[PDB]
Design a protein around this motif. Structure first.
Motif, PDB file in Angstrom:
ATOM      1  N   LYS B  79       0.826  -1.201   0.000  1.00  0.00           N
ATOM      2  CA  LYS B  79       0.000   0.000   0.000  1.00  0.00           C
ATOM      3  C   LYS B  79       0.861   1.252   0.000  1.00  0.00           C
ATOM      4  O   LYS B  79       0.469   2.279  -0.566  1.00  0.00           O
ATOM      5  CB  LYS B  79      -0.942  -0.021   1.196  1.00  0.00           C
ATOM      6  CG  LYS B  79      -2.025  -1.099   1.080  1.00  0.00           C
ATOM      7  CD  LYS B  79      -2.878  -1.169   2.333  1.00  0.00           C
ATOM      8  CE  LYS B  79      -3.915  -2.280   2.223  1.00  0.00           C
ATOM      9  NZ  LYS B  79      -4.741  -2.362   3.458  1.00  0.00           N
ATOM     10  N   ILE B  80       2.021   1.196   0.654  1.00  0.00           N
ATOM     11  CA  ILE B  80       2.949   2.323   0.624  1.00  0.00           C
ATOM     12  C   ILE B  80       3.492   2.534  -0.783  1.00  0.00           C
ATOM     13  O   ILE B  80       3.499   3.661  -1.301  1.00  0.00           O
ATOM     14  CB  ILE B  80       4.080   2.093   1.638  1.00  0.00           C
ATOM     15  CG1 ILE B  80       3.517   2.314   3.045  1.00  0.00           C
ATOM     16  CG2 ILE B  80       5.216   3.041   1.360  1.00  0.00           C
ATOM     17  CD1 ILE B  80       4.409   1.828   4.199  1.00  0.00           C
ATOM     18  N   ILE B  81       3.911   1.447  -1.437  1.00  0.00           N
ATOM     19  CA  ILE B  81       4.417   1.527  -2.807  1.00  0.00           C
ATOM     20  C   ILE B  81       3.312   1.981  -3.760  1.00  0.00           C
ATOM     21  O   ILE B  81       3.571   2.733  -4.710  1.00  0.00           O
ATOM     22  CB  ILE B  81       5.036   0.175  -3.213  1.00  0.00           C
ATOM     23  CG1 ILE B  81       6.365  -0.017  -2.465  1.00  0.00           C
ATOM     24  CG2 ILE B  81       5.299   0.094  -4.727  1.00  0.00           C
ATOM     25  CD1 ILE B  81       7.031  -1.365  -2.696  1.00  0.00           C
ATOM     26  N   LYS B  82       2.066   1.568  -3.513  1.00  0.00           N
ATOM     27  CA  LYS B  82       0.964   2.037  -4.355  1.00  0.00           C
ATOM     28  C   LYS B  82       0.832   3.557  -4.289  1.00  0.00           C
ATOM     29  O   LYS B  82       0.704   4.223  -5.326  1.00  0.00           O
ATOM     30  CB  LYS B  82      -0.340   1.343  -3.941  1.00  0.00           C
ATOM     31  CG  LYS B  82      -1.584   1.755  -4.753  1.00  0.00           C
ATOM     32  CD  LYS B  82      -1.734   0.902  -6.008  1.00  0.00           C
ATOM     33  CE  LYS B  82      -2.959   1.316  -6.852  1.00  0.00           C
ATOM     34  NZ  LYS B  82      -2.651   2.395  -7.854  1.00  0.00           N
ATOM     35  N   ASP B  83       0.886   4.132  -3.072  1.00  0.00           N
ATOM     36  CA  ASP B  83       0.789   5.580  -2.914  1.00  0.00           C
ATOM     37  C   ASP B  83       2.028   6.319  -3.402  1.00  0.00           C
ATOM     38  O   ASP B  83       1.944   7.519  -3.702  1.00  0.00           O
ATOM     39  CB  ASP B  83       0.570   5.943  -1.446  1.00  0.00           C
ATOM     40  CG  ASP B  83      -0.796   5.525  -0.932  1.00  0.00           C
ATOM     41  OD1 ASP B  83      -1.706   5.279  -1.757  1.00  0.00           O
ATOM     42  OD2 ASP B  83      -0.942   5.432   0.303  1.00  0.00           O
ATOM     43  N   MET B  84       3.167   5.649  -3.442  1.00  0.00           N
ATOM     44  CA  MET B  84       4.425   6.298  -3.775  1.00  0.00           C
ATOM     45  C   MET B  84       4.420   6.800  -5.219  1.00  0.00           C
ATOM     46  O   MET B  84       3.978   6.077  -6.126  1.00  0.00           O
ATOM     47  CB  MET B  84       5.566   5.309  -3.583  1.00  0.00           C
ATOM     48  CG  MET B  84       6.958   5.879  -3.783  1.00  0.00           C
ATOM     49  SD  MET B  84       8.210   4.588  -3.565  1.00  0.00           S
ATOM     50  CE  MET B  84       7.958   3.628  -5.063  1.00  0.00           C
ATOM     51  N   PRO B  85       4.900   8.025  -5.471  1.00  0.00           N
ATOM     52  CA  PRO B  85       5.113   8.444  -6.864  1.00  0.00           C
ATOM     53  C   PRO B  85       6.208   7.588  -7.473  1.00  0.00           C
ATOM     54  O   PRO B  85       7.221   7.308  -6.828  1.00  0.00           O
ATOM     55  CB  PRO B  85       5.536   9.911  -6.747  1.00  0.00           C
ATOM     56  CG  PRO B  85       6.123  10.025  -5.363  1.00  0.00           C
ATOM     57  CD  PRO B  85       5.277   9.092  -4.518  1.00  0.00           C
ATOM     58  N   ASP B 216      -1.832   5.318 -11.097  1.00  0.00           N
ATOM     59  CA  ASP B 216      -0.883   4.569 -10.268  1.00  0.00           C
ATOM     60  C   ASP B 216       0.288   5.452  -9.813  1.00  0.00           C
ATOM     61  O   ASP B 216       1.318   4.929  -9.373  1.00  0.00           O
ATOM     62  CB  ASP B 216      -0.378   3.336 -11.046  1.00  0.00           C
ATOM     63  CG  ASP B 216       0.236   2.253 -10.146  1.00  0.00           C
ATOM     64  OD1 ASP B 216      -0.163   2.129  -8.958  1.00  0.00           O
ATOM     65  OD2 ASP B 216       1.122   1.527 -10.645  1.00  0.00           O
ATOM     66  N   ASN B 217       0.131   6.776  -9.918  1.00  0.00           N
ATOM     67  CA  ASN B 217       1.122   7.777  -9.494  1.00  0.00           C
ATOM     68  C   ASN B 217       2.421   7.665 -10.300  1.00  0.00           C
ATOM     69  O   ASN B 217       3.522   7.848  -9.770  1.00  0.00           O
ATOM     70  CB  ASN B 217       1.394   7.703  -7.984  1.00  0.00           C
ATOM     71  CG  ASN B 217       1.694   9.086  -7.364  1.00  0.00           C
ATOM     72  OD1 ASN B 217       1.714  10.114  -8.056  1.00  0.00           O
ATOM     73  ND2 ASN B 217       1.923   9.109  -6.049  1.00  0.00           N
ATOM     74  N   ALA B 428      -1.526  -6.704 -14.326  1.00  0.00           N
ATOM     75  CA  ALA B 428      -0.768  -5.945 -13.346  1.00  0.00           C
ATOM     76  C   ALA B 428      -1.141  -4.463 -13.420  1.00  0.00           C
ATOM     77  O   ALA B 428      -1.694  -3.974 -14.417  1.00  0.00           O
ATOM     78  CB  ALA B 428       0.738  -6.147 -13.562  1.00  0.00           C
ATOM     79  N   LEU B 429      -0.850  -3.757 -12.328  1.00  0.00           N
ATOM     80  CA  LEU B 429      -0.935  -2.312 -12.295  1.00  0.00           C
ATOM     81  C   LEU B 429       0.172  -1.710 -13.156  1.00  0.00           C
ATOM     82  O   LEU B 429       1.125  -2.403 -13.541  1.00  0.00           O
ATOM     83  CB  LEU B 429      -0.807  -1.818 -10.848  1.00  0.00           C
ATOM     84  CG  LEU B 429      -2.068  -1.947  -9.991  1.00  0.00           C
ATOM     85  CD1 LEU B 429      -1.705  -1.835  -8.482  1.00  0.00           C
ATOM     86  CD2 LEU B 429      -3.079  -0.884 -10.394  1.00  0.00           C
ATOM     87  N   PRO B 430       0.078  -0.414 -13.467  1.00  0.00           N
ATOM     88  CA  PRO B 430       1.134   0.218 -14.280  1.00  0.00           C
ATOM     89  C   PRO B 430       2.543   0.043 -13.736  1.00  0.00           C
ATOM     90  O   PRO B 430       3.475  -0.215 -14.504  1.00  0.00           O
ATOM     91  CB  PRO B 430       0.712   1.697 -14.281  1.00  0.00           C
ATOM     92  CG  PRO B 430      -0.774   1.628 -14.219  1.00  0.00           C
ATOM     93  CD  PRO B 430      -1.038   0.521 -13.211  1.00  0.00           C
ATOM     94  N   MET B 431       2.732   0.223 -12.432  1.00  0.00           N
ATOM     95  CA  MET B 431       4.062   0.092 -11.843  1.00  0.00           C
ATOM     96  C   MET B 431       4.089  -0.565 -10.475  1.00  0.00           C
ATOM     97  O   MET B 431       5.125  -1.131 -10.110  1.00  0.00           O
ATOM     98  CB  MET B 431       4.712   1.474 -11.727  1.00  0.00           C
ATOM     99  CG  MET B 431       5.296   1.992 -13.027  1.00  0.00           C
ATOM    100  SD  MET B 431       6.751   0.996 -13.488  1.00  0.00           S
ATOM    101  CE  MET B 431       7.740   1.095 -11.994  1.00  0.00           C
ATOM    102  N   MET B 435       7.179  -2.754  -8.882  1.00  0.00           N
ATOM    103  CA  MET B 435       8.022  -2.100  -7.887  1.00  0.00           C
ATOM    104  C   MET B 435       8.012  -2.878  -6.572  1.00  0.00           C
ATOM    105  O   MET B 435       9.049  -3.005  -5.908  1.00  0.00           O
ATOM    106  CB  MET B 435       7.563  -0.650  -7.696  1.00  0.00           C
ATOM    107  CG  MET B 435       8.503   0.193  -6.791  1.00  0.00           C
ATOM    108  SD  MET B 435      10.188   0.420  -7.440  1.00  0.00           S
ATOM    109  CE  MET B 435       9.885   1.662  -8.700  1.00  0.00           C
ATOM    110  N   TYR B 436       6.859  -3.440  -6.198  1.00  0.00           N
ATOM    111  CA  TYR B 436       6.793  -4.282  -5.003  1.00  0.00           C
ATOM    112  C   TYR B 436       7.671  -5.523  -5.152  1.00  0.00           C
ATOM    113  O   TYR B 436       8.460  -5.846  -4.259  1.00  0.00           O
ATOM    114  CB  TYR B 436       5.342  -4.691  -4.711  1.00  0.00           C
ATOM    115  CG  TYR B 436       5.198  -5.623  -3.520  1.00  0.00           C
ATOM    116  CD1 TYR B 436       5.036  -5.125  -2.237  1.00  0.00           C
ATOM    117  CD2 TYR B 436       5.213  -7.005  -3.691  1.00  0.00           C
ATOM    118  CE1 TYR B 436       4.882  -5.982  -1.153  1.00  0.00           C
ATOM    119  CE2 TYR B 436       5.073  -7.866  -2.619  1.00  0.00           C
ATOM    120  CZ  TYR B 436       4.899  -7.349  -1.365  1.00  0.00           C
ATOM    121  OH  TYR B 436       4.775  -8.206  -0.279  1.00  0.00           O
TER     122      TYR B 436
END
Ligand SMILES: OC[C@H]1O[C@@H](n2cnc3c2N=CNC[C@H]3O)C[C@@H]1O
Ligand SMILES: OC[C@H]1O[C@@H](n2cnc3c2N=CNC[C@H]3O)C[C@@H]1O
Ligand SMILES: *[C@@H]1O[C@H](CO)[C@@H](O)[C@H](O)[C@H]1NC(C)=O
Ligand SMILES: *[C@@H]1O[C@H](CO)[C@@H](O)[C@H](O)[C@H]1NC(C)=O
Ligand SMILES: *[C@@H]1O[C@H](CO)[C@@H](O)[C@H](O)[C@H]1NC(C)=O
Ligand SMILES: *[C@@H]1O[C@H](CO)[C@@H](O)[C@H](O)[C@H]1NC(C)=O
Ligand SMILES: *[C@@H]1O[C@H](CO)[C@@H](O)[C@H](O)[C@H]1NC(C)=O
Ligand SMILES: *[C@@H]1O[C@H](CO)[C@@H](O)[C@H](O)[C@H]1NC(C)=O
Ligand SMILES: *[C@@H]1O[C@H](CO)[C@@H](O)[C@H](O)[C@H]1NC(C)=O
Ligand SMILES: *[C@@H]1O[C@H](CO)[C@@H](O)[C@H](O)[C@H]1NC(C)=O
Ligand SMILES: [Zn+2]
Ligand SMILES: [Zn+2]
Lengths: 497, 497
Positions: B79-85, B216-217, B428-431, B435-436
């Protein structure tokens, strides 16, 4: 314009590729004319199998589970050449796992007073008892002689024994599809054989079988991990570790006197890393004493058993530092299993740091080493050979496709490496030929040939713990074996022109 | 050397600290707020790793994405990586970077869309404004009719999605070899090719790429595109410059709408199955578009499966043509290269040619750790490696992502950017998913927010923005990062340390 012509381009390209060839294991070897003839054949064979997999879009069998690849590799010229090739030494072996399960069945379970039972996990266990059936503690012990005679099919009975003990009866990657599932099966194998294989005359004869089998696979020298402890007689007497060492010393001496073409063996004391630090402290003090009084047969100390969930080297650090802190200091050599893990930045792979701070002579596995650039520097600078056990690392859950084996980038950097087989009896491998084949086919490239094999073979003697006189003699012997192998191979593969 | 534990600890920490400083992000100094977030991330990271290690269960971040996707999304680190730019996604394919759900819910509800089941029992989709398509190999039916007659429209739409996505089943199980899963991957593109090349759908799909990546920031994308052959309802087929202009207009309107978004640039891709005479024309095309669309058109790349198809050397006169002109033209290249488990072959030696051809970035570079001299050239020249971890697992290069060959690259501070490659193909999500898994599998337990921050900054600093654009984008990124840090401290109740 940097590359106006094809010749300018290929000159630059070939210099760059050639510069990496000079840097990898064996890159400084110059093959003579006879070696080149064999090398050209090996390279033609290697290209043929790789190009078929690549262009015909089918799996590269040398890299799949050993359960699937074993029968396939054995029919091929490259395997047959490696089989005939002198291997030099096997430096990473365990003494209860390095001879055939077939011998345990055909020889050991035909001896008097051998009992069997099925445990609560539905695995057969074997032991010896000179005083009737052992106490039925969670297992109903039965005399193997009686069970065999009443089986109704002796050959099927013996085959079942072998099938129930071997990890290659099914594909471990399928049947035990996780690290801790396959380590549960691996641990179980040793529990199955623990009783019978610690009975003194069986243990003596099993060690002799290790020497015979390794010699038969053209291996001239072995260094073996052994607990040394707990060998027991029919009357129940339990011997101490020094006795176990003296027993192995006498078997080794008789063997080398029988076979001047064999260089010999030396022993490393091993202890399982599940025990309390008080036990390891006693075993370190034991090892100090055996190192002083049996120099040149007793090499030092190692900690074994599964690395991820059990005690780290740092967890034993007071015991492991104790020899160096004596007045005068005692330099107890260490051969740590270390970094046998997919973890990164944890207590487990950081065992590599402690192994080097404790001056390890060689490191077992080192699978995590490529993730540790500063440890690599120390390994190269100090000449600490990494014992690479490729079949073991695949079957015991570190990697699936062996071209992903973490030692390939080590070999490309000329990190000192020796190939070994670890526990070849457990999964029906040969002493060295299967592991050398997978290293040759999976851990170096399509254009790496006989020079890589020659360097790995020489490495296994150069990074052995033989003294200067022993090593000079062994290398002369290896050279003679090598010359005979080259000449025989040219005739066998019809390469003389 | 270590009379007390203090001296031993100091040498141990010096070595470990040296490796932490060397690895990606090791020179970053975190401010006090970032340190609070870092401490929580590291506490979370140790808790999941220690549970897997000590409770002897599989490490979910490293298993097949089919299994891990739904498990990781509930965790604080995810969830932190999701919010991360994220900065930028630099390795993307334009027909694989938006949701299949949008193809179903939007594109297949448009007029004149047809479907058929092909000879391999997969649905294909296309558009025909001039009557139904000819029944060549399959029987085309109007989707509008098939949907209206289904009797369960929700199930019909879900069947379309299930028949097109590679994550409907676990590809590691269903397509358990490199060439089986590449067969499925190739099939996916054939299923959508007709519909996704219809001009209004292609335009709107590209806009959806930008919308999803912004959501996805991610603030910036560089996208591979073939550019050519977009077709209208009346059958008009457009040329590559039209395709580029279409994307440029969409991007300009998107940035007008969303000033918090930096934008997009385009790389021309061609599949590496075509004759060299055709690649020559695509190089000439790329030279012209690079000259006339500077700052939107970036250069050229060769795509499609690397192992069985044409090497860079097989195209070398085409690829050297710009540099050989009078005056020379420097056409930038972004080669997919070394996406392979092979070593010492024509495939991994594509990495050599990518460097000789002055590639700006390298796609995948999975084989790079086997090539020590190429590594040093990549480092000294600042050629970023685009690492696509979910892609490399699902498309057959590795099973346990802790064996991903970029982990040893990151440990040496090889310049790396994380990207998602084809996120729409396997849901998958964009990033954030890539990144996770990079954060959890390709660096260690003791690697925290500094690694994430460096990878995010790397995606702008190794983008193909000019120096002025980079400064503007970093100002925007810094503002997003500061907001993310403050928001995260509140969200995870970390403000009071
Ligand atoms: O009785 C032999 C002992 O050695 C262990 N052992 C045997 N082979 C290995 C072991 N331990 C660690 N790593 C894997 C492999 O190299 C098992 C048992 O504790
Ligand atoms: O139409 C898209 C084209 O791009 C290829 N493509 C898409 N994703 C990848 C591709 N090629 C190579 N490596 C794997 C991955 O990075 C497939 C097709 O030819
Ligand atoms: C591919 O296989 C065919 C037989 O099926 C064989 O003729 C051909 O030589 C193979 N190609 C390579 C490069 O091995
Ligand atoms: C087992 O090995 C021993 C020692 O080598 C040998 O004397 C004995 O005869 C063997 N048993 C069988 C059944 O061959
Ligand atoms: C061992 O033998 C038992 C009894 O025949 C059998 O049920 C079991 O599957 C066997 N286990 C293995 C691992 O072969
Ligand atoms: C390791 O070896 C070095 C070099 O011989 C020596 O100075 C040092 O004391 C040794 N350390 C230990 C812990 O044995
Ligand atoms: C292992 O699991 C138990 C619960 O089953 C949990 O309490 C314990 O903390 C876990 N161990 C680790 C190291 O996470
Ligand atoms: C599809 O997208 C287009 C363009 O963005 C939009 O006009 C239309 O409403 C969408 N269709 C559906 C069914 O949502
Ligand atoms: C696609 O749909 C067909 C028809 O329902 C079905 O039989 C097939 O299994 C599906 N294939 C996949 C890969 O989902
Ligand atoms: C690569 O770049 C260097 C430095 O800019 C330049 O001198 C050289 O000509 C280029 N080479 C090619 C093949 O384009
Ligand atoms: Zn071992
Ligand atoms: Zn790609």
């Amino acid at each position: 314009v940097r590359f106006p012509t094809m010749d300018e381009y290929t000159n630059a390209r070939e210099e760059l590729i050639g510069s990496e060839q000079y840097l990898r294991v064996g890159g400084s070897i110059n093959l003579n004319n006879k070696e080149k003839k064999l090398n050209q054949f090996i390279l033609r064979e290697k290209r043929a199998i790789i190009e078929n997999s690549r262009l015909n879009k089918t799996q590269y069998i040398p890299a799949v589970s050993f359960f699937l690849s074993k029968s396939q590799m054995e029919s091929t010229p490259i395997f047959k050449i490696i089989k005939d090739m002198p291997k030099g030494a096997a430096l990473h072996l365990h003494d209860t796992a390095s001879a055939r399960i077939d011998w345990i069945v055909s020889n050991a379970t035909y001896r008097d007073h051998v009992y069997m039972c099925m445990d609560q996990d539905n695995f057969v266990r074997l032991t010896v008892s000179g005083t009737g059936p052992p106490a039925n503690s969670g297992c109903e012990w039965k005399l193997v002689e009686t069970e065999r005679a009443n089986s109704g099919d002796i050959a099927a009975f013996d085959h079942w024994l072998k099938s129930n003990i071997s990890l290659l009866t099914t594909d471990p990657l399928v049947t035990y599809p996780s690290l801790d599932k396959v380590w549960g099966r691996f641990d179980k194998h040793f529990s199955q054989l623990r009783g019978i294989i610690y009975h003194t005359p069986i243990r003596r004869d099993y060690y002799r079988q290790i020497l015979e089998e390794f010699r038969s696979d053209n291996v001239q020298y072995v260094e073996v991990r052994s607990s040394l402890s707990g060998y027991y007689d029919l009357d129940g007497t339990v011997h101490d570790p020094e006795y176990g060492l003296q027993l192995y010393k006498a078997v080794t001496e008789e063997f080398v006197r029988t076979y001047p073409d064999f260089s010999g063996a030396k022993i490393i004391k091993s202890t399982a890393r599940v025990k309390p630090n008080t036990d390891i402290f006693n075993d370190v003090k034991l090892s100090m004493d055996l190192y002083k009084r049996y120099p040149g047969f007793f090499l030092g100390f190692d900690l074994v058993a599964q690395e991820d969930p059990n005690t780290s080297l740092l967890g034993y650090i007071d015991s492991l530092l104790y020899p160096s802190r004596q007045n005068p200091p005692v330099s107890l050599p260490y051969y740590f299993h270390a970094g046998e893990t997919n973890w990164q930045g944890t207590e487990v792979d950081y065992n590599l740091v402690d192994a080097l701070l404790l001056n390890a002579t060689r490191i077992g596995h080192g699978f995590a080493l490529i993730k540790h650039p500063r440890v690599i520097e120390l390994v190269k600078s100090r000449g600490v050979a990494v014992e690479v056990n490729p079949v073991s690392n695949q079957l015991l859950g570190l990697v699936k496709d062996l071209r992903n084996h973490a030692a390939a980038p080590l070999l490309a950097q000329n990190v000192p490496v020796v190939i070994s087989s670890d526990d070849p009896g457990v999964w029906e491998a040969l002493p060295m030929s299967h592991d050398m084949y997978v290293a040759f086919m999976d851990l170096v490239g399509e254009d790496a040939g006989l020079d890589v094999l020659k360097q790995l073979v020489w490495n296994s003697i150069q990074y052995s713990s033989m003294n200067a006189t022993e090593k000079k003699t062994a290398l002369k012997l290896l050279q003679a074996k090598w010359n005979n192998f080259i000449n025989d191979s040219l005739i066998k593969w019809k390469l003389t022109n």
